[PDB]
Design a protein around this ligand. Structure first.
Ligand SMILES: [Ca+2]
Ligand SMILES: [Ca+2]
Ligand SMILES: [Ca+2]
Lengths: 190, 330, 183
């Protein structure tokens, strides 16, 4: 109730400020959906802790451990081994160092099918490509061979940092990236 | 028709609440139009606000029975049983149980076709912090304005009771809010969309300086309650009524406040570029209609909001869209 | 015991205080000062707490689109339309439906599959994660996102998550792989 009154106050002062609010209960989300000036199409957004928590847990009922995979994927962490760490913990901790990112695919991806773009990103760039924002626009997760990458497509990635994902934007014409020692990918594509 | 013992109000013999109780199916099946909706926020244990005082002026024997606005209270059913003892003698009254925040209740009661929605909290008016105290009244107001009926939103008329006058700033958009303006200067109060107890406390000093003038207000505001009626209620028997004599029925011919439009009819000639002084003299001479102020659109061109203008100057220019408040005898 | 299996049954526990994770299992080698995400019960997916979610404030700010990616998955496909229909207060309306809206059944889901048997078992038999990823994507459109591996190799049933392994990462025949899938 306090956080809903805060959004009401913020949007009474100026309707068009993007408000991101944390809610503890799902039924209270109806109240701010009914605010006259709330609009998800501007990116007004209610992060409901109960909705998310139980949906991450429901996902482990379908795919055991997926709550941990997906929760680690949404906070910024960097790997950093220690000599006291057992080898299973080094594998786990190396996985925790990865989180979700968004980038524009380079012109070299245009008119590939999504599976070809995902093979390319993985096998060359060391980047895991999950999904693409298809042009209004819609988010497509692992879409089949029936979809092409457009020009200027946003792609969703799993990687160790944003500066690692930028390889998918800088990715050269094939003429300028045959060697595949991936640190060498850089903006000099032409 | 039947009236109370002083002949001032329309009346029913006592009846149990489940004669007036309705489900959403029954409420939406009923042809509710031009009605009053009371959006009541109450816990079953919360203090009595006395809805008798809201309903009784809407049942003044001044009206014909066919022009009484039907009234629906939306609210907590266990609370409403407690008040029912006082309400049960009024005609054209029904109850829809459950929260006024639920959109299916508001659509079932035809909220978009009502003549007024009254948003009132019976909850303690003291809970937690001064921001939280008006949460339901603000959310109910905003929720009603956010609906559409295309199967009109902010076109529906609201009056909100506020527990803290400072919360008036949350009631509407493009008000240009300030924390330090007094309630009476704020746009929601100037439009008659908001009310609070803080505007009434000068009635101490007016009751002292002219007792007669407090009876003037009350005759109007109660729809004609009297010391006799107050004594009959203080006798603890409930509101006694029945069929009545021609001698007491003479009290039906009494003045009431009404609101009329300059858009059409005989007075439209003044809305077409006349002045308030011309309108006042003409209406008083031809109809005995005594004009006391204007209700004018705030903007002229796109919003539905209007504002009050108590007793304009004689050379004040009129608009064809103006409405005038009038004291009237029929 | 069910001899008429005990710790073989899979649990997920919601924790009100993340510090209590240390009581959930034995031979964890507990410390009070490790963050929840490092603890063995969380690494295995046996525990969860609200404290892992509060970075969704900063991700919602830095990429709104990526929060919709999580939710499409985590809600099983709730939408602004469904959220509005519920906010209309009538309850979840439903019935029989048109072929046009039934097209939404063909959508991606997260699934978990085993390298012990079937066509992918060739990779569990001493292959590498990079070989598995390319093969499954080419032959099935299956997009691999990580591993669920037994913690000990020999006697316990516990397994741990490995998000997006390297391409030269060695596989085991007992591994399970998390996959994005379309049927
Ligand atoms: Ca990282
Ligand atoms: Ca305002
Ligand atoms: Ca332990």
């Amino acid at each position: 109730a306090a956080n809903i009154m805060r959004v009401i106050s913020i949007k009474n002062y100026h309707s068009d400020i993007k408000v991101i609010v944390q809610l503890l209960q799902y039924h209270n989300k109806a109240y701010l959906l009914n605010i006259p000036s709330w609009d998800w199409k501007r990116g007004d957004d209610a992060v409901c802790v109960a909705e998310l928590k139980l949906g991450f847990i429901a996902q482990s009922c379908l795919a055991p451990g997926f709550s941990t995979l997906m929760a680690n994927l949404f906070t910024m962490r960097s790997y950093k081994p220690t000599p006291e760490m057992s080898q299973w913990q080094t594998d786990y901790m190396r996985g925790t160092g990865m989180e979700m990112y968004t980038e524009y695919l380079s012109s070299a991806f245009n008119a590939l099918t999504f599976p070809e773009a995902a093979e390319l990103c993985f096998s060359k760039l060391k980047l895991l490509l999950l999904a693409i924002e298809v042009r209004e626009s819609t988010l497509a997760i692992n879409p089949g061979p029936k979809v092409k990458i457009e020009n200027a497509t946003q792609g969703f990635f799993i990687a160790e940092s944003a500066e690692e994902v930028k390889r998918a934007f800088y990715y050269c014409k094939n003429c300028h990236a045959n060697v595949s020692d991936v640190r060498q990918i850089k903006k000099c594509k032409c | 028709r039947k009236f109370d013992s002083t002949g001032m109000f329309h009346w029913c013999p006592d009846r149990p609440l489940n004669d007036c109780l309705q489900d959403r199916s029954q409420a939406s099946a009923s042809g509710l139009r031009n009605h009053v909706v009371v959006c009541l926020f109450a816990d079953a244990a919360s203090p009595l606000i006395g809805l008798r005082n809201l309903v009784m002026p809407l049942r003044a024997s001044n009206f014909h029975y066919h022009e009484l606005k039907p009234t629906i209270i939306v609210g907590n059913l266990d609370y409403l049983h407690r008040e029912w003892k006082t309400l049960q003698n009024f005609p054209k009254l029904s109850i829809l149980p459950g929260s006024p925040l639920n959109r299916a209740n508001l659509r079932a009661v035809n909220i978009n076709l009502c003549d007024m929605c009254v948003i009132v909290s019976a909850k303690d008016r003291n809970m937690e912090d001064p921001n939280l105290v008006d949460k339901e009244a603000i959310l109910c107001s905003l929720n009603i304005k956010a609906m559409t009926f295309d199967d009109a939103g902010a076109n529906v008329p609201l009056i909100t009771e506020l527990a803290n006058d400072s919360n008036v700033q949350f009631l509407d958009q493009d008000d240009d809010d300030d924390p330090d303006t007094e309630l009476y200067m704020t746009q929601p109060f100037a439009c008659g969309t908001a009310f609070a107890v803080s505007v009434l406390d000068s009635l101490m000093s007016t009751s002292y300086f002219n007792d007669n003038a407090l009876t003037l207000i009350r005759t109007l505001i109660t729809g004609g309650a009297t010391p006799e009626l107050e004594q009959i209620l203080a006798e603890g028997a409930g509101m006694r009524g029945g069929y009545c004599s021609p001698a007491v029925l003479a009290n039906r011919d009494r003045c009431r406040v009404a609101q009329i439009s300059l858009f059409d009819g005989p007075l439209a000639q003044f809305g077409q570029g006349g002045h308030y002084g011309e309108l006042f003299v003409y209406a008083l001479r031809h109809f005995g209609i005594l004009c006391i102020g204007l209700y004018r659109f705030r903007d002229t061109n796109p919003s539905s909001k209007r504002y009050v203008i108590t007793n304009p100057p004689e050379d004040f220019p009129l608009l064809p869209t103006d409405q005038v408040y009038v004291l009237t005898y029929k």
